Amino acid sequence: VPANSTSNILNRLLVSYDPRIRPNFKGIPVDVVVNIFINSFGSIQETTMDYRVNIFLRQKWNDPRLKLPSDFRGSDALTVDPTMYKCLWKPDLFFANEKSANFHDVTQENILLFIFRDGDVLVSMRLSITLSCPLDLTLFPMDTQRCKMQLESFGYTTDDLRFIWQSGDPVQLEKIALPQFDIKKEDIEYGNCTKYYKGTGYYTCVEVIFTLRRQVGFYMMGVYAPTLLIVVLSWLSFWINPDASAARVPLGIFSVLSLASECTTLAAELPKVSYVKALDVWLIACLLFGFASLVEYAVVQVMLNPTAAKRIDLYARALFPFCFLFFNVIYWSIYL
Template sequence: MTRKRLHSVAVWGFFAWEIAVMMSLVASKEPDSPRGRTVPMTSSPSDFLDKLMGRTSGYDARIRPNFKGPPVNVSCNIFINSFGSIAETTMDYRVNIFLRQQWNDPRLAYSEYPDDSLDLDPSMLDSIWKPDLFFANEKGAHFHEVTTDNKLLRIFKNGNVLYSIRLTLTLSCPMDLKNFPMDVQTCIMQLESFGYTMNDLIFEWQERGPVQVAEGLTLPQFILKDESDLRYCTKHYNTGKEKHHHHPILSVTGAATSKKQL
């Protein structure tokens, strides 16, 4: 009797185990079962950035986009946040601006990450190529770092790059004081490439709102005229063996009328 019971229990146990295995196999093949689906795992943001511009990516920040190919077009926009005084004695003026530059770097185009754009920490600026823009008539300048670096870096899926930075500049402004104090002064802001020629880099003003001024902006001794002259030009430099390098230049000119005329 005992043997029959043991045999019956053993057979029932084997039968139950076989049913459990079959149910498990069926469940694993069921496409609508949450446990049966394989969800692709996306890489972490850190892994993605390392793959895009890290040491193993092959990206070299020392080399411009389209190397040995067409020049890089850099679109520029300036937002004038505030003006300091226009100084007749030193013939300069002080201005606080947001400088925005946009260009395309095909090496930074991506499709593996779901977001259309990525806002990156300013420390990542050292990992990518940037235009070598400088202000040709600058007498003094400084960045802003309170409470953190006033810089923005945004990369888009198609490889477009937006680089925005806040600057305070002291710019030279040669003045004609023959009519002082009934004078009208015209000042320029000149942006150039320090080392690249027109074969490598081209600066251009942004089509919409290339130069913007903060609403209600005033000067203590002058009235700013609501007009500006935007220009594209080149400059010739002799850098050694090869002469007559054409460097890209952008300039914006504005005028101010002395309040003493009023």
């Protein structure tokens, strides 16, 4: 028997194999087992509310029309050239929450095909999809994003095609590193959604839900060291003798203008949302503290036109640190 005779007689236009008809036609629905190997992860653009992954999608089913010859004892693995992948039936599978996905093809097409002894067929393709997840920015610097990925079927209803996750360890990833986020290898809980479309019928869908939690290591420094330094610098004006009347005002005005500039600049990175983020709360509170310092200087100056002024200055200098510490404690308690 010629080596190519096996593939020629197993499936080809010469043989009575029609790739336009699903296996078990008008009978038991086809069961598909799907598992995903994550190769790369990242590029989480918070402005566009999307992230880009790179997966090795795999899916196997049962096709009774593709049975290896009984006399052919050539092991279970029967690796077929990827070119012949277009001559056999395939299951439809599209990502529901997808914005732009494409194959990869360099020096060949990235597709692996297996045909086992009893008829099980394995197909693994290398895809680069760009999923979308609606971010929640209630507490932006210390949030916990929940971005998912839901596979689905399009051509056939639940009466013909059905998706089931792999029994053991379906989602795999090897030492994935991200610039701003940490992905838990254990919190990969998944379920199935089987979305129903009015006017057509039911359609199977299985989803994987990750769990990304932002780490406050860059935001902490960049947006809490300068603000704290500005607040302390604004506090420094209290110990200056009130008779200056020309050097204390620049401190307060510089503090408030620097806080305003920081607040304006820090809002360009994030997307536009209706609610109020924790970072905005902190910036507004710091700006209010600086403005309160300046208005207390104004009150002292008004009262000076000096024992009462000195008493007011001492009272304010004693009061402000305690109130600021109380605010910081309650703020970090709410957003722990």
